[PDB]
């Protein structure tokens, strides 16, 4: 009804789920920074809302592994390549070997952004990232991977 | 002007785009061919209405040129672009190159023509950039200068 796409609206949604976060600023652009501890390793999660021309804004969510895989770079690139076609989101491995998963959505500026939609999107990003992270780490627990993992 | 496939097709048709609406599986989608200076492409658009009152808007471009002989090199090139630029690039087993946009919206979200045109334009521009890099494109042929008349 009244919640629009702004960094403060998304921070509130994250706070409401008791996610610990800080709001930072580089250049002119503010962003939300979060740490996240997955079963198989730690990660950074970033969120920003960037305005553009033509009254359109970009919601960007980014996950990056703390762990690095520089010694398996070609192998990882091909694994991520196949997921980039079959699934949502954009994965890559950088020169240092950290693995990234990114989301970019384009919205009319100050579009309605309901809590349910953001939670679905955000949860979706984390679940896809966790799946890739589990594959890199060869993590395949007997009980199966928990769909909902604590930031802890 | 809500997010429905029919709305998006109206926006494209308003811009004189040639398109067909098709059904595969249970999902309807818009199918288009696109001509770039360095090669042709398939361009697909769908709106998939999912759970938690959230829908996915998907826009996909696929090169008709193929790069299977260069698969590893292309994969690394796309990888680096996937880190630094919008959207998700990949190369498939046949060697065709894909660029995907997958956006999440409240179901039946407002989707003004100005935003869709910016989004759709941005996808095409990014894909053209990648296609140009793959092909090493340089304008090869000049303007014919003979006038009307
Ligand atoms: Br993406
Ligand atoms: K998916």
Domain, as residue range, for A5:
1-152
Per the listing, tokens 């008709």 go with B64
Does residue A108 sit at the B interface (CB-CB below 8 Å)?
yes
**Taking CB atoms and an 8 Å cut-off, how many pairs form between chains A and B?**
108
* Residues on chain B touching A10 (C-beta within 8 angstroms): none
Structurally, how many domains does chain B consist of?
1
**Nearest partner of A99 among A38, A140, A146, A22, judged by Cα:** A38
Give the orientation angle of helix B113-135 with respect to helix B5-14, to 10 degrees: 70
Resolution value (Å, 1 decimal)? 2.0
Cα of A119 to nearest chain B Cα, Å: 9
At a CB cut-off of 8 Å and minimum separation 6, what does A102 contact? A60, A61, A62, A63, A89, A90, A91, A92, B82, B83
The ligand minimizing its distance to the Cα of A101 is: 1
Dihedrals phi, psi of A82, to nearest 5 degrees: -65, -40
The DSSP output letter for A71 is G
Cα separation, A142 vs A131, in Å, equals 15
The residue count for chain B: 149
Cα separation, A121 vs A127, in Å, equals 10
Residue ranges of B 113-132 with Cβ closer than 8 A to chain A: 114-115, 117-119, 122
CATH number at residue A104: 3.30.1460.70
Cα separation, B96 vs B43, in Å, equals 13
| Farthest-apart Cα atoms in chain B, separation | 60
**Residue pair A133/A40 in contact by the 8 Å Cβ criterion:** yes
* Residues on chain B touching A106 (C-beta within 8 angstroms): 101, 103, 115, 118-119, 122
Cα of B25 to nearest chain A Cα, Å: 16
**Residue pair B98/B122 in contact by the 8 Å Cβ criterion:** no
* Resolved by: X-ray
What's the per-residue H, E or C state across B56-72? EEEEEEEEEEECHHHHH
Beta pairing, strands B27-36 & B20-24? antiparallel
Does residue A104 sit at the B interface (CB-CB below 8 Å)?
yes
**Nearest partner of B47 among B20, B7, B78, judged by Cα:** B7
Looking at chain A, the number of H-run helices and the number of E-run strands are 3, 6
């Amino acid at each position: 009804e009244t919640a629009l796409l702004t960094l403060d609206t998304l921070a509130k949604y994250l706070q409401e789920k008791e996610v610990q976060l800080d709001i930072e600023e580089n250049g002119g652009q503010r962003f939300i920074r979060m740490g996240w501890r997955f079963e198989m390793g730690d990660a950074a999660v970033l969120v920003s809302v960037n305005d553009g021309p033509n009254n359109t804004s970009r919601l960007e969510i980014t996950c990056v592994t703390q762990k690095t895989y520089a010694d398996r770079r070609a192998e990882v690139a091909m694994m991520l390549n196949d997921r980039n076609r079959e699934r949502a989101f954009a994965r890559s491995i950088d020169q240092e070997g950290n693995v990234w998963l990114e989301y970019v959505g384009f919205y009319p500026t100050l579009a309605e952004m309901p809590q349910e939609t953001f939670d679905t999107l955000f949860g979706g990003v984390l679940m896809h990232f966790q799946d890739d992270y589990a594959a890199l780490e060869g993590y395949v627990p007997q009980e199966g991977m928990q769909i909902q993992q604590p930031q802890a």
